[PDB]
Design a protein around this ligand. Structure first.
Ligand SMILES: *[C@@](C)(CO)[C@](*)(O)[C@H](Cc1ccccc1)NC(=O)[C@H](Cc1ccc(OC)cc1)NC(=O)[C@@H](C)NC(=O)C1=CC2=CCC=CC2=C1C
Ligand SMILES: [Mg+2]
Lengths: 222, 235, 233, 195, 211, 231, 240, 244
């Protein structure tokens, strides 16, 4: 029997700062126990200061991104070159996903950018369209490895202030872009060690009011 | 006979031009755009004193930030309003935001030329679409059955249109207040109307960023009519 | 939904400094039966692209016709059909990729794995893969079926990453491909000795080699092997 | 839903229907009214798959109410029961059938007679002196066979109905949370508020 | 999930948890399971996240169009029915959506339970989700019509807490709402971790648990 | 006369009057000018207002990053045809990863307009279009007529009083074609060309509309104070 | 299918087919609607050219759309049946989807929308019918009276008449009906409705039909003798 | 195109009349007269065949009176072919009703259905209307004995006595004169034949130029019987009433 779905592996990670946002993902593409590509870009600049990554089944992910990029194009045509806000993009993507409620896009989607007040924003989706705005999210193969690390190191969960003994929490101080990129690289280095589908390379897209910037880092190729 | 989508030797669609004649027979509707808001006002024109005038609904809400006035075959406007309301709320569903006044107007005007041998004829009604959005601010549009729409600082449609438009030519300036615009609509309506203007045979409305689209009470309009009479008698 | 009947095995390829190489054997298998021995699975499109196909042969012949028709249609009302507005490898690939993904979304796939190899207008090397699921990826080396498991490891020793491409000559790349085809003949039960090889160079153009054979094979050591453990004679 | 009973006495029809509604392992409601008035002298109780029951009943209700307005006339219980049967017989061969069993209790003003019709989801209609759907009949029909007379009063009909519910409450494993009882006679439809 | 909602003298309380799961994995710690359809209408969510969001936001579109056509707010009864009719179109197609439509209209406070089967029930108290049985236990033993706004809010809060504790697929935080004739009022996000220890000390409950 | 009731009827001399009447609508429309060099292509359009309170009707529409047009005649028909181009440009990108050739875009418009001239019930399009673009064979300018006829040109003009601008371009042919790597000078030549079609009125800040596309220049429209530079 | 555009604009901006549909209404028998303080009355003319008629079974001029709303008309009789049927179907459809009976304003808006649709749809002609729609909204004691016409426009009326010689009876109503103090009782409302028809009807025998609609779905049709008593009392006061 | 040849069958005149309906009525006025008379104990249907021939097989012929079901019958005036199209539709509608409700269709409901079909041809479709006028004679347990008429406009009305076809003006005057409410079937039979005998365009009214039928409760106990008269039976009733 024909199985229309597949698993191309990979892992993605989005973190929202005070006035910036990052969307990272490994560059490895796989089927079963083989490597297809050591460098196959997974996170894309979709225009209007928005970045997107659809992780899971690459064919469905490429189709979704291609469709949203198209949605942005037609948003400009129909509404006098108006900028598509990150919240408006999120809602638009919900309807793209639910259009296939009965034959789903087999992908975990994340977008990142800046809200209308200039603050950092990350939006997370499930395969059928449920979404919400988040501060921190890891998606894909090694999502379960990374998310707890982010709960601990980004939102300071289970961390209290010494001397008080559990009475007073660690205060929620914001993170700089330099501090975030460290947590991203350590997240992917750790995931690469313990997950066979993660490796080869890491590509990070950083979003600020100045625009979209890229950073690439090598990972273990085994 | 002849085609419905036929061109005249002058290069105009017969049916579109004939629908414009029907709009000239309609009751007067006026719109004035200012930096404090856009005012919409209409002549109700009851055919008999037994007709309960408050049931005459020639000013209509499309969204919280968009209003609409009509003139001509007003029955034809109902499907256009229904489409406009649907388009406005549907865009809010897809994009989690208010829809631009221009984009709404364009969606309404796309229906216009969907006629042939689709509906059997063009619409016999013109619309004044007034609203506000963050990008272009306070706006007033004139939507015709030709599918064309012009933006206006001030506009009059209906039977007393060319007389009212000439008056709007002189009176409008870029520093008009909302109160000044209200009195100006009432003034020009009173000038072109057959019967004597009062709170029962004429209606006012406005759209502001804060309060959104509001139709004026008969008690509220009555005070603005009394305020008009006194200021005209003042000189 | 179907099942493949008459099939073609591995298609292998790699980039080198001035272009791309692609190769595939000339066999059409019918299950375990080596039924057809004269099947060409590399199909040139113009003088700048070669499409290598594995999987179901009836679906291959269908694709072969789509491409032939694509060239015809591109020439229509196109004075620059043999120049600026000629078909590019990227155009041909994206067309096929669109077709493959549409067919899988109708649950009626073209049971194939395709590699489009070519050289673009600006001299850039093109090498991208697509299959019955509409899955696409690109790499300095690409291979289908058994080639993915046995050929890629050998070809990745020559071009392990992007920076190794300018350092790789056509002689070295062709040698690596030919060695890979020999290894597949040793170890793939649905392969043949006879194969075709195509080189698309940005200077010398398209070279299409037919009726190639796997040679310099090692079998002599077989004489010494006796039994399955304890047998001496 | 679970249990629906019906009995036709001398001058009226009495319908009893359980109050329970269950999703998963939780009883969401214990006061549910599994019935719709089709016309002033015609009542229909129902039981079957979740959702389908109310949708079907309301659809029938709308059609009968439409007939009443059009003709300014109440259809006989027999006519209504035939209409309902045809809809169910039409439904069973559809892509997704409506899984609903009904009892129709009505008073025919022309003949001055009460009438009870039992119709299952296949479109199987039978006129009866007393009826039930599902497993309800397994426990109650022996009592009704014994005690039922056609000349019974409404009060005697209620007493025999109480005995049926008591037997169900004793021998059924499921808790159906009692029943809402309604009486259909010449004066119309009324609910017995204490049962 | 665990959601609950109940009518009382001073309107209707609505309380939900905030957990989301993907097998044994907790996919989200803080999801919003209430939708603000309008200033006087709320909608709880339980089941498939996508289904809950899509259809309840589509309900809001349809409730908004009602206001524009009629110049009047839709009733809770009519709103719940529009939603139940949507469910009947995709009858047997595999949707999973359990919701309570809470609000205040001309008949007073209104509460309707609606599920994917097209079921539509009116009532004074409901609770949906994997942990509804735990919430019902607290509600049934402590509910009155004569509850004060302060005591009512606490009941719904405490009822979710009970479920969050025992039910493995319920927890994270508690979102509270109170619906009045002037509209709904949000009564905050309450972390269960902190709330549990607070309630344990102040109430004396959860004696078995050590802290 | 008797042969102008519909588009499906030839006259005794072999003329299609409904098409000719549609052509008349273009002549009533406001003037617009098109011209190109080897590196860039430029559209210049005189916008028209209803009165002093009204805005100036937009004349130029973007179709893709590398293609767009200016209109003259029935604006709604231009919206339909431009929407069709947007879809065709977009089909070429999504399916073939290929920017649509300007020549092929003209062929598609020709064929779409033609179907309306041979069938009963419908009507010809009542608008003329000037398409500019930059593709793999350089800069291009096309003139579309609703008869179906599409023509590739160095420069042209359509609308009321368009003959004046067309004569100017016919004289300036050798000069403006050589304006390579200089967008501002090519626009100047277009603004000077459209000026030959003006009477009574002159080019003001909210009257003039300009668009340009080129080698390293996406299709962009200039309105308002952005064109004050060229007045 | 037959797609021919029958309703189209003329050079002077008129849709003749819609205007000729109004002429069919002018030919129809007179219908009148008067709303009192706590009721609405619908009066209807019956032309006495047709005797040997069976009044039991002959279609009545006033039709119930729901238990709380009624519809009378003037114009083509066959056309009116189509509007009434559609209206009745929509009334049940509204109860089924929204769980409330239609308001009088909503039902009118629907019927008016149907009439409008037939003025710009291909292959169809307009309804040669104008309607008077009256009733009381659910849980409301304020009377409602609306009018519709072939073009599709509708509006609310304190009192209104349509059909042949409607110009005359409207003239009567305009001077006799006081807005500040409408018919306080049912008697006064019926009396004014009968008086208005007596300006046009001819004989006050079987030519006048009266239907009283009160709040909370209380609708009754008066008999010949009941109406005849009003006719007697009016003329006896007139002899002075 | 095709528009050139369209007659436009469904339009109003400037006076607000439907051209084709009015012209269809003009056609019907030349058709053989049909009369219906309702009595307390039954209904009579009488109709005149148009200029017949001696070689016409009368006993197997049927051009005027048709049976819709056991309780309802119709008299035809106009195009016979058009009438048969409608009759077969009405026969099906009556059976659909019986299958659905398990009760015989009420007379008015059947009449309304046919009249609605006629109405449709005047408002949409661009086709010519049916050039037919019916007299419906029927019985049900709600209203008892009933007479209706429908015409090409799709408008229907109830009657105590009525005529359609030729000379209806003269025929209606004669019926209005001699009809009384307490009348019986045997008297109504006599009135129907006497009216035809005076209004007919023929020289004399004979058995071979007539179709006749009665609907009587004159059936054994509480039930209704339809009697389509045979040629010999029409001859006998003509002698009995004293016309021949
Ligand atoms: C209980 C947690 C039961 O698990 C609730 O019923 C909860 C309701 C709910 C959650 C979020 C939003 C609205 C309502 N249900 C779930 O969390 C639900 C459980 C579930 C799983 C699978 C099925 O179909 C077999 C039905 C029910 N979980 C999900 O739907 C999963 C797929 N959701 C996510 O993974 C997910 C939702 C989401 C929202 C925003 C951002 C990220 C999100 C993710 C990753
Ligand atoms: Mg690894």
């Amino acid at each position: 029997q024909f199985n229309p779905y597949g698993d191309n592996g990979g892992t993605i990670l989005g973190i929202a700062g005070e006035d910036f946002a990052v969307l990272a993902g490994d560059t490895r593409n796989i089927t079963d126990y083989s490597i297809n590509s050591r460098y196959e870009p997974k996170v894309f600049d979709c225009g209007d200061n928005i970045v997107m990554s659809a992780n899971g089944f690459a064919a469905d992910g490429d189709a979704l991104v291609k469709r949203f990029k198209n949605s942005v194009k037609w948003y400009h045509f129909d509404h006098n070159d108006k900028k598509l806000s990150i919240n408006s993009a999120a809602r638009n993507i919900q309807h793209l996903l639910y259009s296939r409620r009965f034959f789903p896009y087999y992908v975990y989607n994340i977008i990142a950018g800046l809200d209308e007040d200039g603050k950092g924003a990350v939006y997370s989706f499930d395969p059928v369209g449920s979404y919400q705005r988040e501060q921190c999210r890891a998606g894909g193969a090694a999502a379960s490895l990374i998310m707890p690390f982010l709960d601990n190191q980004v939102n300071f969960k289970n961390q209290y202030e010494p001397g008080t003994n559990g009475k007073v929490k660690k205060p929620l101080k914001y993170l700089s872009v330099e501090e975030v990129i460290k947590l991203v690289r350590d997240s992917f280095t750790s995931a690469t060690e313990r997950h066979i589908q993660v490796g080869d390379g890491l590509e990070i897209l950083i979003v600020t009011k100045d625009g979209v910037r890229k950073e690439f880092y090598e990972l273990k190729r085994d | 006979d002849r085609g419905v989508s036929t061109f005249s030797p002058e290069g105009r669609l017969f049916q579109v031009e004939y629908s414009l004649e029907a709009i000239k027979l309609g009751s007067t509707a006026i719109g004035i755009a200012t930096k404090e808001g856009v005012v919409l006002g209409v002549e109700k024109r009851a055919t008999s004193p037994l007709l309960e005038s408050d049931s005459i609904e020639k000013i209509v809400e499309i969204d919280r930030h968009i209003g609409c006035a009509m003139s001509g075959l007003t029955a034809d406007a109902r499907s256009m309003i229904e489409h406009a309301r649907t388009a406005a709320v549907t865009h809010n569903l897809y994009y989690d935001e208010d829809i631009n006044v221009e984009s709404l107007t364009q969606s309404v005007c796309d229906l216009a030329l969907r006629f042939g041998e689709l509906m059997s004829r063009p619409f016999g009604v013109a619309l004044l679409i007034a609203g506000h959005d963050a990008d272009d601010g306070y706006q007033l549009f004139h939507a015709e059955p030709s599918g064309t729409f012009y933006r206006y600082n001030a506009k009059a449609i209906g039977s007393g249109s060319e007389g009212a438009q000439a008056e709007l030519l002189n009176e409008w300036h870029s520093s008009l207040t909302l109160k000044e615009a209200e009195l100006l609509v009432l003034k020009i309506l009173k000038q072109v109307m057959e019967e004597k203007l009062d709170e029962n045979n004429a209606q006012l409305s406005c759209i502001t960023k804060q309060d959104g689209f509001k139709i004026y009470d008969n008690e509220k309009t009555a005070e603005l009519i009394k305020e008009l009479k006194e200021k005209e008698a003042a000189e | 939904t179907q099942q493949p009947i008459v099939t073609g095995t591995s298609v292998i390829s790699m980039k080198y400094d001035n272009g791309v190489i692609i190769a595939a054997d000339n066999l059409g298998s019918y299950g375990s039966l080596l039924r057809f021995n004269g099947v060409e699975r590399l199909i040139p499109v113009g003088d700048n692209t070669v499409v290598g196909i594995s999987g179901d042969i009836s679906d291959m012949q269908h694709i072969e016709r789509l491409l032939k028709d694509l060239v015809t249609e591109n020439a229509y009302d196109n004075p620059l059909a043999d120049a600026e507005e000629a078909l590019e490898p990227s155009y041909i690939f994206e067309y096929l990729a669109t077709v493959m993904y549409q067919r899988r979304s109708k649950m009626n796939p073209l049971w194939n794995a395709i590699i489009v190899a070519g050289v673009q207008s600006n001299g850039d090397q093109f090498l991208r893969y697509v299959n019955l699921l509409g899955v696409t990826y690109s790499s300095p080396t690409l291979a289908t079926g058994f080639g993915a498991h046995m050929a890629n490891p050998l070809l990745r020793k020559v071009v392990d990453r992007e920076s190794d491409i300018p350092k790789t000559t056509v002689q070295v790349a062709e040698e690596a491909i030919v060695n890979a085809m020999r290894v597949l003949y040793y170890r793939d039960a649905r392969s043949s000795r006879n194969f075709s090889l195509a080189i698309i160079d940005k200077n010398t153009g398209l070279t299409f080699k037919k009726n190639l054979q796997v040679e310099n094979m090692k079998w002599d050591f077989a004489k010494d092997i006796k039994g399955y453990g304890t047998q001496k004679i | 839903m679970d249990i629906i009973l019906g009995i036709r006495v001398q001058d009226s029809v009495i319908l009893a229907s359980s109050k329970a509604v269950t999703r998963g392992i939780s009883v969401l409601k214990d006061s549910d009214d599994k019935t719709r008035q089709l016309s002033p002298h015609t009542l229909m109780s129902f039981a079957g798959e979740a959702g389908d029951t109310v949708q079907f009943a309301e659809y029938i209700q709308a059609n009968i109410q439409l007939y009443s307005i059009r003709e300014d006339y109440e259809l006989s219980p027999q006519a209504v029961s035939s209409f309902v049967r045809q809809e169910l017989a039409k439904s069973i061969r559809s892509r997704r059938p409506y899984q609903v069993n009904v009892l129709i209790g009505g008073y025919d003003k022309k003949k001055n007679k009460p009438e009870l019709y039992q119709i299952d989801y296949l479109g199987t209609k039978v006129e009866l002196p007393y009826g039930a759907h599902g497993y309800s009949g397994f426990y109650t029909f022996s009592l009704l066979d014994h005690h039922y007379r056609p000349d019974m009063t409404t009060e005697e009909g209620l007493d025999l109905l109480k005995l049926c519910v008591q037997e169900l409450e004793k021998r059924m494993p499921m808790d159906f949370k009692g029943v809402i009882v309604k009486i259909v006679d010449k004066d119309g439809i009324r609910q017995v508020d204490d049962f | 999930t665990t959601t609950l909602a109940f009518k009382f003298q001073h309107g209707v309380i609505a309380a939900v948890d905030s957990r989301a799961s993907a097998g044994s994995y907790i996919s989200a710690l803080r999801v919003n399971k209430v939708i603000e359809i309008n200033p006087y209408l709320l909608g709880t969510m339980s089941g498939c996240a996508a289904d809950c969001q899509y259809w309840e936001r589509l309900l809001a579109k349809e409730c908004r169009l009602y206001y524009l056509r009629n110049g009047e707010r839709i009733s809770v009864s009519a709103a719940s029915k529009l939603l139940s009719n949507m469910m009947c179109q995709y009858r047997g197609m595999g949707l999973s959506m359990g919701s309570m439509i809470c609000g205040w209209d001309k008949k007073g406070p209104g509460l309707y339970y609606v599920d994917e089967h097209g079921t539509r029930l009116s009532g004074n108290m409901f609770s949906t989700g994997s942990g509804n049985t735990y919430a019902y236990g607290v509600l049934d033993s402590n509910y009155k019509w004569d509850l004060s706004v302060e005591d009512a809010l606490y009941l719904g809060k405490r009822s979710i807490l009970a479920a969050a504790h025992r039910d493995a697929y319920s927890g994270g935080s508690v979102n509270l709402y109170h619906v009045t004739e002037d509209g709904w009022i949000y009564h905050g996000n309450h972390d269960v971790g902190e709330l549990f220890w607070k309630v344990k000390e102040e109430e004396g409950s959860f004696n078995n648990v050590i802290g | 006369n008797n042969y102008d009731g519909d588009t499906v009827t030839f006259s005794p001399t072999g003329r299609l009057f409904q098409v000719e009447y549609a052509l008349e609508a273009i002549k009533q429309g406001s003037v617009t000018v098109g011209l190109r060099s080897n590196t860039h292509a430029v559209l210049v359009a005189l916008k028209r207002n209803a009165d002093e309170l009204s805005s100036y009707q937009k004349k130029i529409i973007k179709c893709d990053e590398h293609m767009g047009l200016s209109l003259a005649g029935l604006a709604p028909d231009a919206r339909v045809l431009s929407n069709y181009l947007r879809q065709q440009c977009n089909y070429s990108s999504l399916v073939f990863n290929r920017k649509l050739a300007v020549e092929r875009a003209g062929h598609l418009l020709c064929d779409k307009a033609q179907k309306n001239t041979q069938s009963y019930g419908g009507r010809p399009y009542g608008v003329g279009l000037l398409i500019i673009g930059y593709d793999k064979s350089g800069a291009h300018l096309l003139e579309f007529q609703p008869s179906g006829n599409v023509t590739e040109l160095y420069g042209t003009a359509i609308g009321a009083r368009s003959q004046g601008a067309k004569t100017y371009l016919e004289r300036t042919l050798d000069t403006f074609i050589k304006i390579d790597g200089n967008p501002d000078e090519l626009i100047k030549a277009g603004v000077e060309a459209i000026s030959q079609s003006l009477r009574d009125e002159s080019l003001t800040v909210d009257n003039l509309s300009i668009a340009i596309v080129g080698k390293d220049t996406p299709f962009t429209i200039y309105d308002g104070e952005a064109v004050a530079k060229y007045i | 299918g037959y797609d021919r555009a029958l309703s189209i604009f003329s050079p002077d901006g008129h849709i003749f087919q819609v205007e000729y549909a109004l002429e069919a209404v002018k030919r129809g028998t007179c219908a009148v609607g008067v709303k009192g303080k706590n009721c609405v009355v619908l009066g209807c003319e019956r032309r006495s050219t047709l005797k040997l008629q069976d009044t039991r079974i002959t279609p009545s001029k006033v039709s119930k759309i729901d238990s709380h709303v009624v519809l009378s008309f003037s114009g083509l009789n066959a056309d009116s049946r189509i509007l009434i049927e559609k209206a009745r179907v929509e009334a049940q459809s509204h109860r089924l989807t929204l769980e409330d009976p239609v308001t009088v304003e909503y039902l009118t808006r629907y019927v008016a929308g149907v009439q409008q649709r037939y003025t710009q749809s291909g292959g169809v002609r307009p309804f040669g019918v104008s309607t008077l729609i009256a009733g009381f909204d659910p849980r409301d004691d304020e009377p409602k009276l609306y009018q519709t016409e072939p073009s599709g426009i509708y509006s609310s009326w304190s009192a209104q008449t349509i059909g042949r010689n409607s110009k005359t009876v409207r003239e009567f109503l305009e001077k006799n009906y006081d807005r500040k103090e409408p018919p306080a009782t049912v008697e006064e409302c019926v009396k004014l409705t009968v008086r208005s028809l007596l300006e046009v009807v001819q004989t006050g025998a079987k030519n006048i039909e009266i239907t009283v609609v009160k709040p909370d779905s209380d609708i009754v049709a008066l008999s010949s003798e009941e109406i005849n008593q009003y006719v007697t009392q009016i003329e006896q006061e007139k002899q002075e | 195109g095709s528009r050139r040849y369209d007659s436009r069958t469904t339009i109003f005149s400037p006076e607000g009349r439907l051209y084709q309906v009015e012209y269809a009525l003009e056609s019907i006025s030349h058709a053989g007269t049909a009369i219906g008379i309702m009595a307390s104990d039954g209904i009579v249907l009488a109709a005149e065949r148009k200029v017949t021939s001696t070689l016409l097989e009368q006993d197997t012929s049927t051009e005027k009176l048709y049976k819709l079901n056991d309780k309802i019958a119709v008299a035809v005036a106009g195009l016979t072919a058009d009438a048969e199209i409608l009759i077969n539709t009405a026969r099906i509608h009556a059976q659909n009703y019986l299958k659905t409700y398990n009760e015989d269709i009420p007379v008015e409901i059947l009449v309304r259905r046919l009249s609605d079909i006629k109405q449709g041809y005047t408002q949409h479709g661009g086709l010519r209307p049916f050039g037919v006028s019916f007299i419906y004679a029927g019985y049900d347990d709600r209203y008892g004995y009933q007479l209706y008429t429908s015409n090409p406009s799709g408008n229907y009305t109830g009657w105590k006595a009525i005529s359609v076809g030729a000379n209806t003006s003269a025929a209606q005057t004669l019926l209005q004169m001699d009809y009384k409410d307490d009348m019986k079937v045997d008297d109504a039979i006599e009135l129907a034949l006497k009216t035809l005998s005076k209004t007919t365009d023929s020289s004399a009214l004979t058995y071979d130029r007539l179709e006749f039928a009665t609907i009587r409760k004159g059936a054994n106990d509480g039930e209704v019987y339809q009697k389509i008269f045979k040629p010999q039976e029409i001859k006998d009733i003509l002698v009995k009433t004293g016309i021949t």
